[PDB]
From a paper:
Ribonucleotide reductases (RNRs) are highly important enzymes for all life, as they are solely responsible for the first committed step in the synthesis of the deoxyribonucleoside triphosphate (dNTP) building blocks of DNA. Class III RNRs, strictly anaerobic, generate on a separate activating enzyme NrdG the same type of 5’-dAdo radical through homolytic cleavage of a C-S bond in S-adenosylmethionine, with the participation of a [4Fe-4S] cluster. Here we present the crystal structure of a second class III RNR from Thermotoga maritima (tmNrdD), which, as purified and crystallized, surprisingly does not display such a cysteine, possessing an isoleucine (Ile) in its place.
The dATP/CTP complex represents the first structure of an anaerobic, class III RNR with a substrate and the first of any RNR in complex with a triphosphate substrate. The cytosine base stacks imperfectly on top of Tyr227, equivalent to Phe194 in T4NrdD. Effector binding induces a conformation of the substrate-proximal side of loop 2 that projects the side chains of Arg221 and Gln224 towards the substrate base, thereby enhancing CTP binding through three H-bonds between these side chains and its base. As in the other classes, the α and β phosphate groups of the substrate are held in place by several H-bonding interactions to the N-terminus of a conserved α-helix (499–514). The γ-phosphate group interacts with the side chain hydroxyl group of Tyr112, His114 and the main chain amide group of Asp115. With the ribose positioned as described, Ile359 at the tip of the finger loop is positioned in between the radical-bearing residue Gly621 and the substrate; however it does not reveal an obvious pathway for transfer of the radical (see Discussion). Furthermore the crystal structure of the dATP/CTP complex shows that the SIGG motif is compatible with substrate binding.
Author numbering:
A (entry chain A): 1 to 47, 64 to 330, 350 to 560, 565 to 633
B (entry chain B): 1 to 49, 64 to 329, 350 to 560, 563 to 637
Amino acid sequence: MKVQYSFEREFEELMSDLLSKYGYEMFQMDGLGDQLDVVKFTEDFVRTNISTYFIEISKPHTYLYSLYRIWQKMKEMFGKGVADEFVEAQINGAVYLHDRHHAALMPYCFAYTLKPIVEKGLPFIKTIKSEPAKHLSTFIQHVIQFVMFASNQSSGAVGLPDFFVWMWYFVKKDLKEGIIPRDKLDWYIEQHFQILTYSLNQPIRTTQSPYTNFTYLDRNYIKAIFEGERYPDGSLITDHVEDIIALQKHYWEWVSRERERQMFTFPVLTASLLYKDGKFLDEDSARFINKINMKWQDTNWYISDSIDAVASCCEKLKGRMNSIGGSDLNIGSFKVITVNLPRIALESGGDREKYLQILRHRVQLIKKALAAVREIIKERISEGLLPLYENGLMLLNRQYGTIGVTGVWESASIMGLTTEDIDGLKYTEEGEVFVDNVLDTIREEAEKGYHEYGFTFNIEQVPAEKAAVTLAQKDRFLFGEKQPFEIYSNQWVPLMANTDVLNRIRYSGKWDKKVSGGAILHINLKTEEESFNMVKMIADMGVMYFAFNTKISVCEDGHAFYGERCPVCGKAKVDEYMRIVGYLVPVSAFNKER
Amino acid sequence: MKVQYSFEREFEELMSDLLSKYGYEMFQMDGLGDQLDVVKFTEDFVRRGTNISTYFIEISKPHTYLYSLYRIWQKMKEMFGKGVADEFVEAQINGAVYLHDRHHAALMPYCFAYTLKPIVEKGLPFIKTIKSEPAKHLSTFIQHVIQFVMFASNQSSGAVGLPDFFVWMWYFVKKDLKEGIIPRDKLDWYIEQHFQILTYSLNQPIRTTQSPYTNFTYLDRNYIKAIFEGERYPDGSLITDHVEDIIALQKHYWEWVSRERERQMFTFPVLTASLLYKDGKFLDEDSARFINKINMKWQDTNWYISDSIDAVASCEKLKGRMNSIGGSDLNIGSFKVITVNLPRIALESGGDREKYLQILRHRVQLIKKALAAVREIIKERISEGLLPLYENGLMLLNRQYGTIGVTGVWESASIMGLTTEDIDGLKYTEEGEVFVDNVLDTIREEAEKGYHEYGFTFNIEQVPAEKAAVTLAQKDRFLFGEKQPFEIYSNQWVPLMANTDVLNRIRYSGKWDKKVSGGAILHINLSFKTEEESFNMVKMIADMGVMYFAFNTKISVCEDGHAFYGERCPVCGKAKVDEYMRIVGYLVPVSAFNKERREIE
Ligand SMILES: Nc1ncnc2c1ncn2[C@H]1C[C@H](O)[C@@H](COP(=O)(O)OP(=O)(O)OP(=O)(O)O)O1
Ligand SMILES: Nc1ncnc2c1ncn2[C@H]1C[C@H](O)[C@@H](COP(=O)(O)OP(=O)(O)OP(=O)(O)O)O1
Ligand SMILES: Nc1ccn([C@@H]2O[C@H](COP(=O)(O)OP(=O)(O)OP(=O)(O)O)[C@@H](O)[C@H]2O)c(=O)n1
Ligand SMILES: Nc1ccn([C@@H]2O[C@H](COP(=O)(O)OP(=O)(O)OP(=O)(O)O)[C@@H](O)[C@H]2O)c(=O)n1
Ligand SMILES: [Mg+2]
Ligand SMILES: [Mg+2]
Ligand SMILES: [Zn+2]
Ligand SMILES: [Zn+2]
């Protein structure tokens, strides 16, 4: 049976024109082939439970609408030619539209402050309304309901950096009023840690749990952010730095302790530390994080050289944006659109000058697309469909349009700008300059964007959990043996590359700053003092976001351990946890997705 | 653009035939017209002002219905041949029958009333994102109940029943109190605070588009004793040793609910009190008088009346009350409801009552085959691993009815010319009452045969039909026009808004509730003069044989959701802006019902 989609002839012609050129396998690769056939899709899915079915079924169709809607908007704003060009690039694999099934419907991610939740409660829930919390139990509960609300109003992370700032207030209150058995205060704190953590690891996005971030704010950051800001009882938040610190430390100690019982992913843990002139200003917090990380290495290191971007937080945008974790308070991105660099290399045929003209062009096309998507978001807001915006929780003016990049290594390899020696794989000198030029080119267009389109752009070397595959596929499909790589890399140097770590650190030191920390370095791995030194060295080199990776075994009951046998129940290892794309995940789910 | 779906050409030919015989308008009414066009659907949704999270659930419903329709057609063809398969598809699309939750029909089952026993004894091993050990505290127990409701409510189409909630909650209240986890001087707070955490969670949009549908049951002493006979708590103690404890906690919730509404109104959980009643008296009179008293305020509780506990003792033909609104016995559910359009048969019969009854038996027998097919599809999904509720022994297939729904009884008889009026208002004629006796008995016979026929037990229910009551009258009015003067069909033996003496309503429910085995409801719009007067009236109704009933008040609410009576909020002083009313058996915002009803006119 045939089903009609009321597309403009111009679109249907375009789609037709592309289908004839690229063929069906390309549309199949883009998820617009057999996946649009409900009967085929369903009996295919028949091979996670049924609640997943209803989320997965509509994605090809909502993608196809969003593609169409963005095409329409881009044509309105920049003419048919530009609109057609984006669609072709999206389908052929020149660019990767992220969360494309959502792209013309809701935004991507934002790091929230819980302040307005503490102060207004939950008025934006329409099925029922909640007053502001008066107890630790309710406060925790409000966060849970908020993450449920927010994680289905957006595609990406829900960041909760200042969570522990507000939690302490309700610890003090319930302690004041004698709700806690003081003979068991640590159990009480750790119970609310447990209840929150386990809830955030429930399939609240149906197909999976929400993506959430916690931040250990160091003493310097707590001071800068909440300078002058008061608690609901009128007291000053800054007066309780040490109180807020110990609560944070408590959680990190507890989670390290909890993993043996049950291994979990979320929240993603980052420690934000200020570091100047070869030293941590909050050295106490620094040595603490380094110590807790010794067990699982489950906290990412965020390093910054100033706190100016976060002063008195609570038109050009400043503040670190990172998809994995570490994003500053009240910073996000409404959408990412990535540039396939290996594609540009294959197109350039070696001509670095043509590459940089092709690159500069595609970045500008992306900027136009981001500007179109942003217009759609604003439509959806006015249409009453995005209450996160209307209740002042998600802030559009505080969301970047993000220009993504991936496959940096593979691109330079295709250009023939990599090599190997006693220290392993590396870039040639021309290669490093080429990277400087690529990143400099994109930086130029990002800055021009602000004056061009009225909002701030940023740049990120994205995790590319899926794009790293479907792009190498589309390029393989369109260039064959010329594209030898099975997947593209999400770091300056590939994770599984035989190379001295000192080179990895240097490249990150060179280029992390160019993307404003919009990247991550993590190395697969023996003393505490030895470990802490390594951290300082990496920080000296200028690396802005990094972590160390361990192989965490698990059994079918969820016990965390190292080895082949569980030291809890004796059940053998069955799966592994590892930081593959920035956060700790089961390898089995990762490989099966790929 | 054009999109292909891989149907057997036999099905495609069938759909082709039906379209030519009924026209595109028929498919539009069935939700298989413009609704399947994503661009049309989206731009339509985009200017329907609920937020963007709703879009992704509503978008696929026409498509998933189409698949489910196609899958049932296939299975029905495999079990009973193409004629029966074609006969069913035609009957669904034209409106002879109503497939409930049709967008889920080939994917997941309908409803069930669970016991939290396995949750208590095993925790949450079936959640895949993370695993929880058996609870050890009140806080975790509550939090487990919540994860269970989220789990179950998105793997079924209908109600998540929690009859024995207060039985199990109490044990953890006692555990945390003993071990100094709960401060004694704040014993009542910790209890009402977790009443509040659970209840508010249950009114969160956990099903995205809406909150879950949940039920609570006040089990009276007789029911507690019967159900948990010989059953022990985790500490080893007998549950029947703590009947009084369980009762008191239950009373605390009802007292609390009635206390909590003025602060914030809410629908869920839907409240029912199950009471044993024989020979003109309540066997647990203390519980009955309590419920009678508490209800004086909001009338927010439904009365469930039974005359024996034989059907729930120590909890292959299935017995146990199944009711969609609430009151469903522990470990009872339905895997699917398919309703028969009775006014349709009236229109076909032309008045010939013998002809009517022939058509009815046929369509019931057609419905039974459909239920049997769906049940086979469910079993397929289970084995395919898509329905863990079964694998973990929470949802029980053997304990699930196949349901032959009914609707439009009044309107049907009216068309037959078997209704009238007198000094005490609208009522059935003598032959009309006989006719209704024949209709229900006929269906009942076939249901009973179904067990021997199809291997599982069948039940009957005059369903709420919040939507079906509209779309069927629409289709009938489209196919018969002037012959069908009703805008909607009724979900009670006598229409709620029909001027009739209440005693007539009670009589008819007394007569016919037992035929559907309490598979119905009776609610009367109201003030009483005394508590004792109300209690007498409850006993009168219970004498008459009514099995499920309630009284209705018009609960005002302001913009912040405070519950009150009148035009001014006693809490904030803000004016009334909306009402709450039991329209189909549970309390809802009238503005929500009216518009949801309007979005299908
Ligand atoms: N699970 C939940 N989800 C959302 N809101 C909730 C939940 N539980 C409680 N609430 C709401 C109810 C209240 O409007 C609000 C604050 O409740 P709470 O902090 O317990 O104060 P309260 O109004 O209950 O007074 P108290 O509990 O001190 O008697 O939170
Ligand atoms: N919000 C939640 N959702 C799901 N599971 C949870 C939640 N909070 C805690 N759990 C899990 C964690 C445990 O595996 C299990 C039992 O927790 P609980 O009853 O608090 O005892 P416990 O194992 O934490 O011992 P204790 O609390 O006495 O240290 O429930
Ligand atoms: N289970 C996940 C994984 C990732 N993310 C979000 O997506 C980001 C990384 O996405 P990426 O892997 O780059 O996206 P792809 O999978 O390549 O593409 P798509 O947009 O289709 O997911 C994370 O930082 C996070 O904010 C998420 O919400 N949930
Ligand atoms: N918001 C609601 C309303 C009802 N129900 C379930 O559906 C039953 C009543 O459904 P009914 O009104 O008979 O179905 P319709 O809405 O007419 O048809 P459909 O199956 O298409 O919903 C209730 O008892 C309840 O178990 C539900 O899960 N959620
Ligand atoms: Mg605990
Ligand atoms: Mg409270
Ligand atoms: Zn184990
Ligand atoms: Zn009010």
